[PDB]
């Protein structure tokens, strides 16, 4: 509202139906889950080497000075590529594209 | 020259300067000018489609990434030659992306515009027995955050609605109304005002 | 149908310890109409400065 | 409640004004012409080629919190400038008096924010720390800017009523000579002399004398204009 | 030339000095040359002269 | 119709006004001082040190056509001048309102047709 | 009779005003702004931001030798200035009329006899 200068709050909305749900707290949770899983997030790739013992769900220190990053992150995905010798770390969250 | 750097009578007025030529896009970010921009794409579309902009700029130690949280106001102004600045895009940030492009730290900002608010809202009331003019008033005032001005509405074939539009996306309902009427244009102006009026 | 709040526009919320206010939030405006239940999803988070 | 104008320009500016060394204004012809247009004693809003106050309010949006500033120019006084002693590069001479900037707004400032249902003060303000940084303050009873400024008007966002000081030049002079003079309100003075005619408030032109009170003594036996 | 407030010692004009209000403190000199320093005769004043009124004749 | 005046000077002029990039005016003191003489709101013929109007007509020949103009200075306004924003070299900012040139005739013009 | 003021400044000044070619004034904003403040027809002392004259008399002893002049500014006209025609660097055009310098005093002149 404040950003765009809208007359009234900037509602963006979905309607869901879950007919077999009888309890209101479950319906709330479904709505909350819907909001949460598409709420804005840091994601993205850091390319390194090694880290064969690293699993998703693990934590790692990452320093990238040109990017202003000096944090401890959760690993969402690891990709190992021979030939090019790359370990690609997806941090915080992974989201698809057309797939999603 | 610049003031205070020349003794009088010694130099020519406004030298070494000359008239502006070429095209310039200025990006404004919550009122601040973004200075390191090297490319701009602005797309403006009819209603089925989203209006968007992409801005490309250089960043240093992630200082510029920090300026563009989701929902940040972006404006794009255009000038060619010595023409006044024209506000061509207004929108909100949906994606900020920073990646290495062959050594360069490239920041790409993507922004959507006001047409998202007609798209991501649903009709809540039953407009059965309303005229299209009455329906537009109800829908825009109740179901959308954009401003309603009765003078921007010109229905070319006003008729009563026999369907309850009570779950449709607002955009889809409006398009159905346009189909029933004289094929009118609708949308949100830069005034933040809704319009519904004859084409061409 | 809670007496003081039905028919009212709600604009703010806060977590409390008796009378003392722990948190405060500004909400987007809504009318709490007849027969409507109102609930909170109040997230409290404990973090470091890295 | 604060608002930057992106296309506003401020002139003239030096190291001896509030700007850094790389950032002194450029020496444009139009700037010299617009600066020479000054013709007052205070801060004021300039007039067009037909004497209308520029920087008008237009499209006042009733109670809906918003108003448009039309294009124009304003003269804004600042005190405390430094100038250069003749043929020295160094800024060293502190000025004794306040001296004007021109602020040119080349386009409309559209839909300026007002606080709801109340009196709001419309201040136009310059930031003398950087070149051409200009801003508007417009809020409920909002305190005047610290920086060089002028009051463009005041707006009540309940009624939509607008009133404005500073809209043309205030002008202390010693002596003035004219063909014609035409005031809106009071033509004031410790003497009024009519050399050929006085036409009164009802539009009747007296060629001759006027008559004071207690006159009746003249109408009596042997007086001038006896009855 | 156009202003809001002209603040002067002396003002002198070779045609009309118009105003929708003219205010003369201290002196007024008319078209003949009489220098008044008090209030002036309204038209149709004569009632004042009649029994007991101000400026009786 | 023509009467080209060969000795007139006009200030201020740069490529923000209508001139080429070579043909900018010089930054003379006398120009700045004469331009500072502006006080009106429109275009006007300037007064001397007493207030008497300059650029007077003289020496009308009547049936034999011609007339003479005395020396002096006029202020003429022009619209749509470009100026240089901030610290920039480039002329980029259009002026919203009409602004004065000081036009100086240093000598009399003889026998205008 | 002469009391010389060590901190006074005069603007604008060129070859065309009388000063030598090494000694022309630098074009400060504060000078341009103060010069623009002129509005009259003749020479006069300038008024402050409130419309009150500067350069006042002060400490006017009735019977001693000395008086004080306050800070401020005045406008002084001079005739026979030369200006640069067109884009010629040469000062070649005599002005038809008289034009103001600004005289600026940054301090009170103390004890003028
Ligand atoms: K149709
Ligand atoms: Mg120069
Ligand atoms: Mg040039
Ligand atoms: Mg569009
Ligand atoms: Mg669209
Ligand atoms: Mg500037
Ligand atoms: Mg410098
Ligand atoms: Mg508007
Ligand atoms: Mg020229
Ligand atoms: Mg002749
Ligand atoms: Mg000097
Ligand atoms: Mg020289
Ligand atoms: Mg003394």
Complete DSSP assignment for G32-64? HHHHHT--SSS-EEPB-TTS-BSS-EES--SSS
Tokens matching residue F69: 């103009």
Across the interface, of B4, B8, B10, the residue whose CB is closest to G13 is: B8
Longest dimension (CA), chain E: 54
**Which chain B residues are closer than 8 Å to D7 by Cβ?**
84-85
In contact, E32 and D195? CB cutoff 8 Å: no
Which uninterrupted H or E stretch holds E5?
strand E3-7
C-alpha closest to that of F84 among G110, D85, D104: D104
φ, ψ dihedrals at B104, nearest 5°: -80, 140
Cis peptide before D86 (omega within 30 of 0): no
φ, ψ dihedrals at B117, nearest 5°: -80, -25
In contact, G77 and G42? CB cutoff 8 Å: yes
Task: List, in order, residues 6 or more apart from A47 with CB less than 8 Å away.
Answer: A86, A87, A88, A89
**Which chain D residues are closer than 8 Å to G48 by Cβ?**
41, 97-98
Q: What is the DSSP letter of F89?
A: S
Task: List, in order, residues 6 or more apart from A4 with CB less than 8 Å away.
Answer: A10, B73, B90, B92, B114, B192
Say how many CA atoms lie within 13 Å of D221 toward its Cβ: 0
> What is chain A's alpha carbon radius of gyration, rounded to the nearest angstrom?
19
**Which chain A residues are closer than 8 Å to B30 by Cβ?**
3
Residue with tokens 């002096």: F72
**How far, in Å, are A34, B63, D163, E53 from residue A16 at the CA level?**
9, 39, 53, 94
φ, ψ dihedrals at D84, nearest 5°: -95, 125
C-alpha closest to that of B31 among B87, B75, B63, B91: B75
Tokens matching residue A46: 């850091």
Q: Is F56 helix (H, G, I), strand (E, B) or coil?
A: coil
The technique by which this structure was obtained is cryo-EM
The strand pair at E3-7 and D169-172 is best described as parallel
In contact, B76 and B89? CB cutoff 8 Å: yes
Partnered with residue E15 across adjacent β-strands are none
Between CA A59 and CA A76 the distance in angstroms is 10
Between CA B136 and CA B170 the distance in angstroms is 10
Residue with tokens 């009709």: B123
Tokens matching residue D208: 């001759």
Interface touch G27/B12, C-beta < 8 Å: no
Q: Within the 52-81 window of chain F, which residues sit less than 8 Å (CB to CB) from chain B?
A: none
Q: Within the 73-102 window of chain G, which residues sit less than 8 Å (CB to CB) from chain D?
A: 73
**Which chain D residues are closer than 8 Å to F93 by Cβ?**
7, 9, 104, 106
Interface touch B192/A8, C-beta < 8 Å: no
Tokens matching residue E36: 């008044």
Which uninterrupted H or E stretch holds G30?
helix G29-36
C-alpha closest to that of B107 among B184, B183, B181, B27: B27
Between CA G75 and CA G68 the distance in angstroms is 20
Residue D80 region by backbone torsions, left for phi larger than 0, else alpha for psi between -120 and 50, else beta? left
B10 touches chain D (CB under 8 A): no
Interface touch B2/D26, C-beta < 8 Å: yes
**Which chain F residues are closer than 8 Å to D28 by Cβ?**
14, 16, 83-84, 91
Q: Which residues of E are annotated as a binding site for Zn(2+)?
A: 45, 49
C-alpha closest to that of D63 among D17, D120, D18, D23: D120
Tokens matching residue F79: 């619209």
Dump the DSSP string for G14-25: -TTTT--TT-PP
> What is chain C's alpha carbon radius of gyration, rounded to the nearest angstrom?
14
| Reduced 3-state DSSP string for chain B | CECCCCECCCCECCCCCCECCCEEEEEEECCEEECCEEEEEEECCCCCCCCEEEEEEECCCCCCHHHCCCCCEEEEEEEECCCCCEEEEEEEEEEEEEEEECCEEEEEEEEECCCHHHHCCECCCCCCCCEHHHHHHHHHHHHCCCECCHHHECCCCCCECCCCCCCCEHHHHHHHHHHHCCCCEEEECCCCEEEEECCC
| Reduced 3-state DSSP string for chain D | CEEECCCCEEECCCCCCCCCHHHCCECCHHHHHHHCCCCCCCCEECECCCCCECCCEECCCCCCCEEEECCEEEEEEECCCEEECCCCCCEEEECCCCEEEEEEECCCEEEEECCCCCEEEEEEEECCCCCCCEEEEEEECCCCCCCCEEEEEEEECCCCCEECCCCCEEEECCEEEECCEEEEEEEEECCEECCCCEECCCCCEECCCCCECCCHHHCCCCCCCCC
Between CA B168 and CA B160 the distance in angstroms is 18
Between CA D153 and CA D68 the distance in angstroms is 12
Which uninterrupted H or E stretch holds G31?
helix G29-36
Between CA G79 and CA D146 the distance in angstroms is 42
Interface touch F15/B2, C-beta < 8 Å: no
Between CA E41 and CA E55 the distance in angstroms is 12
**How far, in Å, are F8, F9, F37, F69 from residue F5 at the CA level?**
6, 10, 23, 11
Residues whose beta carbons lie less than 5 angstroms from ion ligand 2: B 1, 6, 11; F 27; G 27
Which uninterrupted H or E stretch holds G104?
strand G99-105
Interface touch D187/E13, C-beta < 8 Å: no
Dump the DSSP string for G66-99: -EEE-SEEEEEEE---EEE-TT-SSEEEE-SS-E
Tokens matching residue F5: 């005046």
Task: List, in order, residues 6 or more apart from A20 with CB less than 8 Å away.
Answer: none
Residue G27 region by backbone torsions, left for phi larger than 0, else alpha for psi between -120 and 50, else beta? beta
Between CA C26 and CA C14 the distance in angstroms is 9
Resolution in A: 2.6
Cis peptide before G12 (omega within 30 of 0): yes
Task: List, in order, residues 6 or more apart from F36 with CB less than 8 Å away.
Answer: D36, G35, G36, G38, G99, G100
φ, ψ dihedrals at E46, nearest 5°: -50, -30
Q: At what angle are helices B170-180 and B132-143 packed, to 10 degrees? A: 170
Question: What's the CA-to-centroid distance between B12 and ligand 3, angstroms?
Answer: 8
C-alpha closest to that of F48 among F31, F28, F73, F70: F73
Q: What is the DSSP letter of G26?
A: B
Tokens matching residue A19: 């007919």
Other CB atoms within a 10 A radius of the CB of residue E7 amount to 15
Partnered with residue E34 across adjacent β-strands are none
In contact, D152 and D125? CB cutoff 8 Å: no
Burial environment of residue A69 by CB neighbours within 10 A (0 to 12, 13 to 18, 19 or more): middle
**How far, in Å, are F28, F91, F104, G87, G90 from residue B10 at the CA level?**
8, 21, 21, 11, 10
Between CA D225 and CA E4 the distance in angstroms is 45
Long-range contacts of the stretch C6-13 (C-beta < 8 A, 24+): C6/C32, C6/C33, C6/C34, C6/C36, C7/C31, C7/C32, C7/C33, C7/C34, C8/C32, C10/C38, C13/C40, C13/C42
A97 touches chain B (CB under 8 A): no
Tokens matching residue G9: 């400044």
Residue with tokens 């400024």: D149
**How far, in Å, are D93, D96, G10 from residue G48 at the CA level?**
18, 9, 18
Question: What's the CA-to-centroid distance between D116 and ligand 4, angstroms?
Answer: 30
**Which chain G residues are closer than 8 Å to F22 by Cβ?**
87
Among chain B residues, the shortest Cα distance to G26 is held by B7
In contact, G26 and G11? CB cutoff 8 Å: no
G22 touches chain D (CB under 8 A): yes
Q: Is G2 helix (H, G, I), strand (E, B) or coil?
A: coil
Q: What is the DSSP letter of A92?
A: S
Which uninterrupted H or E stretch holds G103?
strand G99-105
Burial environment of residue C25 by CB neighbours within 10 A (0 to 12, 13 to 18, 19 or more): exposed
Q: What is the DSSP letter of F30?
A: H
Residue with tokens 């109409």: C33
Task: List, in order, residues 6 or more apart from B45 with CB less than 8 Å away.
Answer: B51, B115
In contact, B137 and B177? CB cutoff 8 Å: no
**How far, in Å, are A86, A96, D118, D205, D214 from residue A81 at the CA level?**
5, 20, 66, 105, 116
**How far, in Å, are A86, B53, B105 from residue B98 at the CA level?**
20, 16, 7
Strands (E) across chain C are located at 9-13, 16-17, 20-21, 25-31
C-alpha closest to that of D197 among D210, D186, D188, D184: D210
A1 touches chain B (CB under 8 A): yes
Between CA F27 and CA G84 the distance in angstroms is 8
In contact, A74 and A62? CB cutoff 8 Å: no
The strand pair at E28-29 and D192-193 is best described as parallel
In contact, D106 and D7? CB cutoff 8 Å: yes
Between CA D46 and CA D150 the distance in angstroms is 12
> Do G and B have ≥3 inter-chain CB pairs under 8 A?
yes
Between CA D164 and CA D155 the distance in angstroms is 9
Q: Is F80 helix (H, G, I), strand (E, B) or coil?
A: coil
Residue with tokens 């255009």: B78
Between CA G76 and CA F77 the distance in angstroms is 26
In contact, F99 and D44? CB cutoff 8 Å: no
Tokens matching residue A41: 């997030």
Between CA G8 and CA D51 the distance in angstroms is 37
Q: Is C26 helix (H, G, I), strand (E, B) or coil?
A: strand
Between CA D13 and CA C1 the distance in angstroms is 65
Task: List, in order, residues 6 or more apart from B101 with CB less than 8 Å away.
Answer: none
Helix ranges (H only) for A1-100 are 24-36
φ, ψ dihedrals at D223, nearest 5°: -80, 170
F36 touches chain G (CB under 8 A): yes
């Amino acid at each position: 509202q404040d950003s765009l200068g809208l007359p009234s709050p900037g509602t963006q909305r979905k309607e869901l139906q879950r007919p077999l749900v009888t309890d209101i707290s479950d319906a709330e949770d479904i709505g909350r889950k819907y909001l949460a899983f598409r709420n804005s997030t840091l994601s993205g790739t850091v390319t390194t080497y090694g880290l064969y013992d690293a699993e998703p769900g693990d934590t790692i220190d990452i320093t990238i000075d040109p990017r202003g990053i000096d944090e401890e992150f959760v690993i969402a995905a690891i990709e190992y590529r021979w030939g090019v010798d790359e370990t690609i770390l997806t941090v915080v969250e992974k989201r698809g594209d057309v797939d999603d | 020259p610049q003031l205070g750097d020349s003794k009088l009578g010694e130099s020519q007025l406004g030298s070494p300067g000359t008239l502006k030529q070429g095209v310039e896009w200025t990006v404004v970010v919550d009122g601040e000018e973004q200075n390191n921009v090297w490319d701009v794409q602005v797309v403006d579309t009819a209603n089925p489609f989203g209006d968007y902009a992409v801005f490309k700029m250089d960043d240093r130690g992630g200082q510029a990434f920090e300026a563009y949280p989701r929902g940040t106001r972006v404006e794009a102004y255009v000038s060619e030659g010595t023409e006044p600045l024209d506000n061509r895009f207004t929108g909100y940030v949906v994606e900020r992306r920073e990646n290495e492009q062959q050594g360069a730290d490239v920041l790409e900002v993507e922004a959507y515009s006001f047409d998202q608010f007609l798209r991501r809202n649903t009709v809540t009331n039953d407009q059965t027995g309303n005229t299209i003019s009455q329906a537009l008033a109800d829908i825009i005032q109740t179901d959308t955050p954009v401003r309603f001005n009765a003078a921007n509405i010109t229905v070319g074939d006003d008729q009563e609605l026999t369907r309850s539009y009570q779950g449709d996306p607002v955009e889809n309902a409006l398009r159905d109304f346009a189909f029933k009427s004289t094929n009118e244009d609708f949308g949100v102006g830069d005034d933040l005002e809704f319009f519904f009026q004859p084409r061409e | 149908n809670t007496s003081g709040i039905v028919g009212q526009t709600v604009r703010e919320a806060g977590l409390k310890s008796g009378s003392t206010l722990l948190t405060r939030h500004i909400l987007a405006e809504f009318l709490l109409d007849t027969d409507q239940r109102l609930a909170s999803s109040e997230s409290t988070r404990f973090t470091s400065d890295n | 409640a604060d608002t930057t104008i992106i296309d506003a320009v401020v002139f003239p500016q030096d190291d001896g004004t509030g700007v850094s060394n790389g950032d002194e204004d450029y020496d444009s012809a139009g700037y010299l012409a617009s600066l020479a247009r000054y013709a007052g004693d205070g801060s004021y809003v300039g007039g067009d080629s037909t004497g209308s106050p520029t920087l008008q309010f237009a499209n006042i949006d009733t109670a809906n919190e918003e108003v448009d500033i039309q294009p124009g120019h304003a003269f804004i006084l600042e005190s405390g400038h430094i100038v250069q002693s003749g043929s020295q590069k160094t800024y060293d001479t502190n000025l004794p008096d306040s001296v004007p900037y021109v602020v040119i707004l080349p386009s409309s400032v559209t839909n300026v924010p007002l606080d709801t249902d109340v009196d709001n003060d419309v201040w136009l303000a310059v930031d003398p720390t950087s070149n051409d940084s200009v801003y508007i303050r417009s809020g409920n009873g909002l305190s005047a800017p610290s920086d060089p400024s002028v009051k463009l008007g005041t707006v009540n966002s309940s009624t939509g009523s607008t009133t404005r000081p500073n809209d043309l030049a205030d002008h202390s002079v010693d002596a003035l000579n004219a063909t014609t003079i035409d005031a809106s309100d009071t033509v004031t003075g410790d003497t009024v002399d009519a050399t050929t005619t006085l036409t009164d408030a009802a539009g009747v032109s007296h060629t001759g004398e006027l008559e004071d009170i207690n006159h009746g003594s003249k109408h009596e036996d042997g007086g001038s204009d006896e009855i």
